[PDB]
Every structure is written in C-alpha cells, then in structure tokens.
RNA sequence: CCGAUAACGAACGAGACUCUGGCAUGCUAACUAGUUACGCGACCCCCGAGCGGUCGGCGUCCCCCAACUUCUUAGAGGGACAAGUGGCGUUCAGCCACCCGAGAUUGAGCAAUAACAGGUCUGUGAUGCCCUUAGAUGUCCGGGGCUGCACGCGCGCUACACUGACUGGCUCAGCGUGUGCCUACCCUACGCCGGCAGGCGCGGGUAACCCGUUGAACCCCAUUCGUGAUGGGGAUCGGGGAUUGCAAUUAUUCCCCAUGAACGAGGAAUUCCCAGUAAGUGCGGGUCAUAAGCUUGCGUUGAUUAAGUCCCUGCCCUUUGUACACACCGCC
C-alpha cells in the first residue's frame, strides 16, 4: 500500500494537477486498523469552490483480512477551455493584467489622419 | 397637542428632577398618539431612552407567559388605567406616571460577589437609566401581583399602583420594594 | 444632622469593575460645586453627561 | 470592529497601485471601475473591498510614501539623495578647532602647524562619566 | 492584519466562497400573476349628484376584442466599501460616533493537522473471523410480546385562572403537499342526508390553472360568569355512534352524553436565550390503511434585560513548576 499509493500519487501529479490526496484506511498490517494519508500540492477543504475544483472517489477493497477503504481527492487545474478541468477561477485569485509603457513625455503634436 | 389616546396633552407634564429628565420621554418630540410603534428600540444602547415611556410601560405589562405578545391587550390596559387615574385623582395621567417613575426608582442598590452579610456586600448608587428600568418593572409587578386572584381588574390595580407611587404611602409595591433596596444598601455601605 | 441628598454629573466613565462587570467606575462632579469631583462606582447603563443622585457623598474610592 | 482587510484585498491593492497609479484616484467608484478592466476579480464583494483599500492607500500615498512603490516618488528619492550637493562643502571649515593632543598627533605626522588648524584650550576637571548606580 | 525580526518563501484552516433576507416605480417579460382604465351589469342612491359609492359580478388572447408591470412571479444586472465627516491610534493596522442610505454585522451551508478502542456488523448483494444451516439462528403462517406496574429519572403536553373561561360577531398568513415501477394507499371544491364524527353523487387538479383570495390560531369586538378547586383543569371511568383494516380485546383514531381527580405558581437544584430574538399562537412536511403530546420547517403577536466580566463552568496564547506521559479520573 505504501508503494501503490505513491505510484497513484505520482501519476496524478504528472498528469497535471494542483494537488492530490489519497487515504487508504483499514486493517493494514496487523489487526489494529490505521489510516495512511499521502498528500501533496494544494488541497482545499472548505467553502463552495470545493465543488468545482476537487474530485472525490471512495472505493472499497475486499482483501482477505477485511475491507481496506480508499479515498482519493484530486484538485483539478483551472482551464479557460475547461475540458481538462474547472473554468471558473478560484474565487480569491485576483490576476492583474500587465500594462504597457504609455509614457508620452514629449512635445504635443497633432497627427492629421 | 398630540393628545395621547386622543386626550391628555403632553405639553403640560414636567419632571421634578434633572437626573431622570433625559431618560423619560413624555415631551413634545416623544409625544405620540398611541403607545404602539415597532421602532427597534433594542437595537443599541441608550435607544430605550428616546422610546416614549408609555410605550415602555406598555412593553413591561406583557409578562408571565400568558401574555407575551399581546400588545393590543396591554394598550387598552394602559388606556383604561389612565382613564381611571384621571377620574380617581383629577390630574393628567401622564403626570401621575412620571411621578410614579421618579418616586419608585431605587436611588441605591447593593451588589458584589464576596461573602455577603445579608444579601449583597457593597452599596452602589444606580444609574439614571436603571432608575427608570427598575421603576417601570416594579410598578408592573405590583399591579400584576395585586390582581392575580381578585375581582379587581388589571386596569384598576395598575391605576392604584401609579397613584400610590406618585405619592408614596407604603401602599405601592414599587415604593415598598424601593425602600427595602435603600435599607439594604444603607446597611451594606 | 443627616447629610442631604444631592446631584452629581458624570464627566468621564473610568471603566467596569466588580469582577462581573455589573459596576462601572465613573468620575462624578458635584453640580452644587464644580470643584468637588469624586470617583464613584455605579450599576446599570451609564454615559457621559448624565446626572445621577447621591444619597451620601463620600464612601469609597480606588484606582483601577 | 471586525473590518480588518485580509491579505488578498490588501495584497491585490498594492499591486494595482504600482501597476496603475496614474489611472487610479481617490474615488471609490472611479477606482472600482478601473479594477474591472485591470484585473479579473472573481467576486464583486472582493473588488469593492479591493477598491476600498486602494483609496486608503491612494489617499495615503498622496502624502506619505507607503511601501508600495511609485516612479514619481522614486525619482525624487533619487534627486534628493543624488543631488542638493551644497555649493560650499561642509568639510571645508575655514578654521578647524583643535585639541592640544590632536595638534601633538598631527605634529608627529609632520602635517601639524597648518594655519587652518587652531588649538583649543583643554578642558579641566575630568568630570566625564556618569554618576554610578541609581541616584 | 500592521510591524520588529535568523529567518525567507509558502500550504491548509479563518477570510474569500454558496444559498437566503433586506432596496431597487431602473431592464426583460407574463389569459397558469395581477393592477389601472374602459364597457356591461347588480345594488344603494336619489337632493342630484353621476368621472357617486361597493362588488374576488362579467367582458376587452374567446387575438384584434385595453393598456401597463406599481403590486406577484424570476432572470440579467446594480447596491455597502469602514465609502464620507469628526475624534482616538506609532497617526500604520484599526476602533468609536454621526450624515446620506433599504442595508453601515441577516441567518445558515461548507469547514484544517491529529485523535477517540465514542456510535453504528439492527442501512446495504459493505465486510473479515466465529456460530447456525432442514426439529434452521434461513423463510413463511397463526397467536402473543415489544404497552405489561410497589418505584426512580430524562424530553415534553396540559394547567393552576378574571392579563381568564364561555357564547356570538368581526378579521388577517407562509413554508409546503397533492393520484403511486414494484405499490394496493392522493389533495379536495359543490350539492344532498345527519346533531357530530361521517355517508351518498357530481366534478377540478400530475398542479402560479383545482383544493385556495389556503376566510388558521392567537388577537379584536360584544355576552354570561365573579375570586369558590367556580362556567378554572379535564385526568379517571360508564354507556352509545362512525371511520381505517383481513382483524380494533390489552380500549387505533374520531364523535356524543355522563364522572369531574390532582393541580391555588412548585424545595435543594437546573436548561435555553440578545431583535422580528425569548415567549404566546396556530399551520405545513416526515412518519401515515389508521393516526402527533415527537421532529423538521413556516407564518402571526412581539417584549424585559445587557453592549459587560472572568466571579462560577470552560476555551485560546505566553511564562512558570512538575516525582505526571493510560497524561490530576495522574502519581504516591
Ligand atoms: Mg468559510
Ligand atoms: Mg362550565
């Protein structure tokens, strides 16, 4: 599970994602049950924007000892086209366009056009 | 000029002490036709000062669970009590109310947390707004207890309480409670 | 013999006291004589300028 | 109470007052409309907050030099630091007051006996140092 | 957040966000929403009114046979930012008061790291191990029980009355539901019979079209009562009549007539609450063949007190002590 989750985590980051989080919880190793959480990148939890940037899947693995749960959360990258992911920007992201020079320090003239 | 309840002019009443003059609202600006206005008087602090006192008295009569929203019943209670006191004494009903509030407000009280002698430890003079707040609460409770199990109606029990308070005769429940508060504070100076 | 009841005016409100906040220390100036200004503690809603009555002048004073 | 402006509203405000100082002003409404063509702000409650703090800086930047930069202020920081060179230098004193010991030291350097140097009467009492302890 | 700064650059949480409430006589529209106008009527008038007053009576998308969107609905937008003024502040971050403003803090939803031997194997064709598996711990059918009562506790309902009860008259809501895959069971207008619960025919609605202008309660206005366990209170119990169902006894529920018990504001203690809030008051949804003292929402009437504190119960940060680490319900 330690190696399998890392491979899943690396695939998600390579495919292009702001963040990911896999939590495989169950009767790993002995009878006592534990949860292993692999997280990297940005991963929001609260507010509305969770609905249109994160993708959550919960699966059950029926191993011999019992059931070993799987929870995967992937934060999708913002895309203007929006095919790969969300189209709305994150609500708190303010992006400022870069202005040009627009100096004009010289004498005033009239251009007859 | 505004004739509260269509009579009983407000431009003749007067407050005998400047301590309570600015938290009683019977004058021309706070003179209303009727003691009923959803004016948002509890939004902030010292907004209940500019609330007319007849409205303040009306808002305090609706108590003891049975009567928590019944303002129309209370308005007629104030209306009937005011008619009685003018008929039973002969002066302006508002004037009796202001005298009742002035005479019933406990000038000092006692409060603390340390090991109290009888009730409270340290004698503390009250604020002019607590004076009016206690005065209205004491008159209403006096009229309430006086009419809980007797044929005498609320209007008459409210009428005599304001009349007795406007004079001070050890007969009003309000002044009896006021004198008791003074004694405890005085004994606990 | 008894000191007569009088009237004093609040120049400033020092702050809450009593360890439950029920009492506010205030600076009362006597209207009979502006020079005599004493510090008292009062209960209930208070603001600058209002006049409160004093059953007796000098009881207690303390800095917070 | 409770109207502190978060980083985002403040952090965005500073960027648009250095990118676009000239266009902006001291009006909440004129600035709140420039912030509609100069930035892609997701929320309306965010631009008005951003526009609001911009005025606080634009009102303040007209007087003091806030940490947000500005070319017209920076050129004067340059002009005052790099010029106002006094026509007469401060280090060209006509007469140089000289302690006896310094004149002795300058004598050893063999640069003593300069006319501009004027010896001063030595101080007496050796009353330097401060009284020790409190009091 | 501002600032100092062996830290610099970041991440989550908070905030932003989503929904809702409050304002838009500004835009888009509405015979499944209306209003004004006009024309018919019906009445009261009559002095004589006459562009009189009332009508939830009827028409003008029964398309040529009114307009308009104020009111209703719902979309796009705007609006509030501590924006403006004064004061305080290192005059920074911000705080206080006020003008203009619908609004100068509307309520919720989401909600971090780490953890609990917290609850659920009685939600699942989620599941490991164990147990049973034909005289079954599977499954079905009949009956009973889950209600059983010397007693203790918890959540609530009804009250103790006259700020009331009763009888009549008057007059105002808003959420929201409504005929079923299996699946049998919908919401009901109107007419008639009956005293009531109900019964019988005729319709409307898969719904802004029908229930429905949801004629709700409290409240309001008049009547009787008159400080008594009284016309308060309606527990207990007897007889009778209906509805649901295959079945009502251990009373399903409802109605009618009788009995009228404690209870006269409740010890020590203890809960919840800051504005359309508490509380009074009813109405929908869920459960539902039958049903609400429950719960989830909704409207209606509408306050007292306070703009504070760490006193009690706890929480957060820093410093400190420690023989504690299952962590003071510790150790000894
Ligand atoms: Mg949030
Ligand atoms: Mg009776």
UniProtKB/Swiss-Prot annotation, chain A:
Record location of the Glycyl lysine isopeptide (Lys-Gly) (interchain with G-Cter in ubiquitin) cross-link: 88, 100
Cell compartments where the protein resides: Cytoplasm; Nucleus; Nucleus, Nucleolus; Mitochondrion inner membrane
Documented effect of changing residue 35 to A: No effect on phosphorylation by PRKCD
Modified residues (N6-succinyllysine): 18
Modified residues (Phosphothreonine): 106-107
Superkingdom as given in the UniProt entry: Eukaryota
Post-translational modification: Methylation by PRMT1 is required for import into the nucleolus and for ribosome assembly.
Modification type Phosphoserine: residues: 95, 110
Cross-link (Glycyl lysine isopeptide (Lys-Gly) (interchain with G-Cter in SUMO2)): 100
Disulfide bridge positions per record: none
Substitution effect: residue 95 to A: Reduced phosphorylation by IKKB
Family: Belongs to the universal ribosomal protein uS3 family.
Subunit comment: Component of the 40S small ribosomal subunit. Identified in a IGF2BP1-dependent mRNP granule complex containing untranslated mRNAs. Interacts with HNRPD. Interacts with PRMT1; the interaction methylates RPS3. Interacts with SUMO1; the interaction sumoylates RPS3. Interacts with UBC9. Interacts with CDK1; the interaction phosphorylates RPS3. Interacts with PRKCD; the interaction phosphorylates RPS3. Interacts with PKB/AKT; the interaction phosphorylates RPS3.
Protein name (database record): Small ribosomal subunit protein uS3
Organism, as annotated: Homo sapiens (Human)
Residues of the full protein shown: 115 to 227 of 243
UniProtKB/Swiss-Prot annotation, chain B:
Molecular function via GO: mRNA binding; RNA binding; rRNA binding; structural constituent of ribosome
One cellular component term from this protein's GO annotations in UniProt: extracellular exosome
Keywords on record: Acetylation, Cytoplasm, Isopeptide bond, Nucleus, Phosphoprotein, Ribonucleoprotein, Ribosomal protein, Ubl conjugation
GO biological process: cytoplasmic translation; regulation of translational fidelity; ribosomal small subunit assembly; ribosomal small subunit biogenesis; translation; translational initiation
Function summary: Component of the small ribosomal subunit. The ribosome is a large ribonucleoprotein complex responsible for the synthesis of proteins in the cell. Part of the small subunit (SSU) processome, first precursor of the small eukaryotic ribosomal subunit. During the assembly of the SSU processome in the nucleolus, many ribosome biogenesis factors, an RNA chaperone and ribosomal proteins associate with the nascent pre-rRNA and work in concert to generate RNA folding, modifications, rearrangements and cleavage as well as targeted degradation of pre-ribosomal RNA by the RNA exosome.
A Pfam family that the UniProt record links to this protein: Ribosomal_S7
Subunit structure: Component of the small ribosomal subunit. Part of the small subunit (SSU) processome, composed of more than 70 proteins and the RNA chaperone small nucleolar RNA (snoRNA) U3.
Glycyl lysine isopeptide (Lys-Gly) (interchain with G-Cter in SUMO2) cross-link, chain position(s): 32
Protein name: Small ribosomal subunit protein uS7
Location within or outside the cell: Cytoplasm; Nucleus, Nucleolus
Positions carrying N6-acetyllysine: 32
Modified residues (Phosphoserine): 127
UniProtKB/Swiss-Prot annotation, chain C:
Main location: cytoplasm
Domain of life: Eukaryota
Record Gene3D superfamilies: Nucleic acid-binding proteins (2.40.50.140)
GO molecular function: RNA binding; structural constituent of ribosome
InterPro entries: NA-bd_OB-fold, Ribosomal_eS28, Ribosomal_eS28_CS
GO biological processes: cytoplasmic translation; maturation of SSU-rRNA; ribosomal small subunit assembly; ribosomal small subunit biogenesis; ribosome biogenesis; rRNA processing; translation
Location within or outside the cell: Cytoplasm, Cytosol; Cytoplasm; Rough endoplasmic reticulum; Nucleus, Nucleolus
GO cellular component term, pick one: cytosolic small ribosomal subunit
Modified sites of kind Phosphoserine: 37
Keywords: Acetylation, Cytoplasm, Diamond-Blackfan anemia, Endoplasmic reticulum, Nucleus, Phosphoprotein, Ribonucleoprotein, Ribosomal protein
Family matches, as HAMAP family: Ribosomal_eS28
Family: Belongs to the eukaryotic ribosomal protein eS28 family.
Disease connection: Diamond-Blackfan anemia 15, with mandibulofacial dysostosis: A form of Diamond-Blackfan anemia, a congenital non-regenerative hypoplastic anemia that usually presents early in infancy. Diamond-Blackfan anemia is characterized by a moderate to severe macrocytic anemia, erythroblastopenia, and an increased risk of malignancy. 30 to 40% of Diamond-Blackfan anemia patients present with short stature and congenital anomalies, the most frequent being craniofacial (Pierre-Robin syndrome and cleft palate), thumb and urogenital anomalies.
PANTHER family, per database record: 40S RIBOSOMAL PROTEIN S28, SMALL RIBOSOMAL SUBUNIT PROTEIN ES28
Gene assigned in the entry: RPS28
Swiss-Prot record, chain D:
Residue numbers of Phosphoserine PTMs: 113
UniProt-listed PROSITE patterns: RIBOSOMAL_S17E
Cross-link (Glycyl lysine isopeptide (Lys-Gly) (interchain with G-Cter in SUMO2)): 103
Gene3D superfamilies: Ribosomal protein S17e-like (1.10.60.20)
Single GO term (MF): RNA binding
Cross-link (Glycyl lysine isopeptide (Lys-Gly) (interchain with G-Cter in SUMO1)): 103
PTM summary: Ubiquitinated at Lys-103 by RNF14 and RNF25 in response to ribosome collisions (ribosome stalling).
Xref: InterPro entries: Ribosomal_eS17, Ribosomal_eS17_CS, Ribosomal_eS17_sf
Gene Ontology, cellular component aspect: cytoplasm; cytosol; cytosolic ribosome; cytosolic small ribosomal subunit; focal adhesion; membrane; nucleolus; nucleoplasm
Compartments where located: Cytoplasm; Nucleus, Nucleolus
Keywords noted in UniProt: Cytoplasm, Diamond-Blackfan anemia, Isopeptide bond, Nucleus, Phosphoprotein, Ribonucleoprotein, Ribosomal protein, Ubl conjugation
Pfam families: Ribosomal_S17e
Assembly and binders: Component of the small ribosomal subunit. Part of the small subunit (SSU) processome, composed of more than 70 proteins and the RNA chaperone small nucleolar RNA (snoRNA) U3.
Protein name: Small ribosomal subunit protein eS17
Organism (species): Homo sapiens
């Amino acid at each position: 599970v330690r190696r399998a989750c890392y491979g899943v985590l690396r695939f998600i980051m390579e495919s292009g994602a702001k963040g990911c989080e896999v939590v495989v919880s169950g009767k790993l190793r002995g009878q006592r049950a534990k949860s292993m959480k692999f997280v990297d990148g940005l991963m929001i939890h609260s507010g509305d924007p969770v609905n249109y940037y994160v993708d959550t899947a919960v699966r059950h693995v029926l191993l011999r000892q019992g059931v070993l749960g799987i929870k995967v959360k992937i934060m999708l990258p913002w895309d203007p086209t929006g095919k790969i992911g969300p189209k709305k920007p994150l609500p708190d992201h303010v992006s400022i366009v870069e202005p040009k020079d627009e100096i004009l320090p010289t004498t005033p003239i009239s251009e007859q056009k | 000029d505004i004739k509260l309840f269509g009579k009983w002019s407000t431009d003749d009443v007067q407050i005998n002490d400047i301590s309570l003059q600015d938290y009683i609202a019977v004058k021309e600006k706070y003179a209303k036709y009727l003691p009923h206005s959803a004016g948002r008087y509890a939004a902030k602090r010292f907004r209940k000062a500019q609330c007319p006192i007849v409205e303040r008295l009306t808002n305090s009569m609706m108590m003891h669970g049975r009567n928590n929203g019944k303002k129309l019943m209370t308005v007629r209670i104030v209306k009937h009590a005011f008619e009685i006191i003018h008929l039973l004494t002969g002066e302006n009903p508002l004037q009796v109310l202001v005298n009742a509030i002035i005479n019933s407000g406990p000038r000092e009280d006692s409060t603390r947390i340390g090991r109290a002698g009888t009730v409270r430890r340290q004698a503390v003079d009250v604020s002019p707004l607590r004076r009016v707040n206690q005065a209205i609460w004491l008159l209403c409770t006096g009229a309430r207890e006086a009419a809980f199990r007797n044929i005498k109606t609320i209007a008459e029990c409210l009428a005599d309480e304001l009349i007795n308070a406007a004079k001070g005769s050890s007969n009003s429940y309000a002044i009896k409670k006021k004198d008791e508060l003074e004694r405890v504070a005085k004994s606990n100076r | 013999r008894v000191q007569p009841i009088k009237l004093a005016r609040v120049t400033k409100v020092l702050g809450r006291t009593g360890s439950q906040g029920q009492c506010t220390q205030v600076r009362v100036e006597f209207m009979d004589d502006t020079s005599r200004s004493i510090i008292r503690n009062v209960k209930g809603p208070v603001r600058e300028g209002d006049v409160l009555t004093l059953l007796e002048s000098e009881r207690e004073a303390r800095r917070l | 109470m409770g109207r502190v402006r978060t980083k985002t509203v403040k952090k965005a405000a500073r960027v648009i007052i250095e990118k676009y100082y000239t266009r902006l002003g001291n009006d909440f409404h004129t600035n709140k409309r420039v912030c509609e063509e100069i930035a892609i702000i997701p929320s309306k409650k965010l631009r008005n907050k951003i526009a609001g703090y911009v005025t606080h800086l634009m009102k303040r930047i007209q007087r003091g030099p806030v940490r947000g930069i500005s070319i017209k202020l920076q050129e004067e920081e340059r002009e005052r630091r790099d010029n106002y060179v006094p026509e007469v230098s401060a280090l060209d004193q006509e007469i140089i007051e000289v302690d006896p010991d310094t004149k002795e030291m300058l004598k050893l350097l063999d640069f003593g006996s300069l006319s501009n140097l004027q010896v001063t009467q030595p101080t007496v009492g050796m009353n330097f140092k401060t009284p020790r302890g409190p009091v």
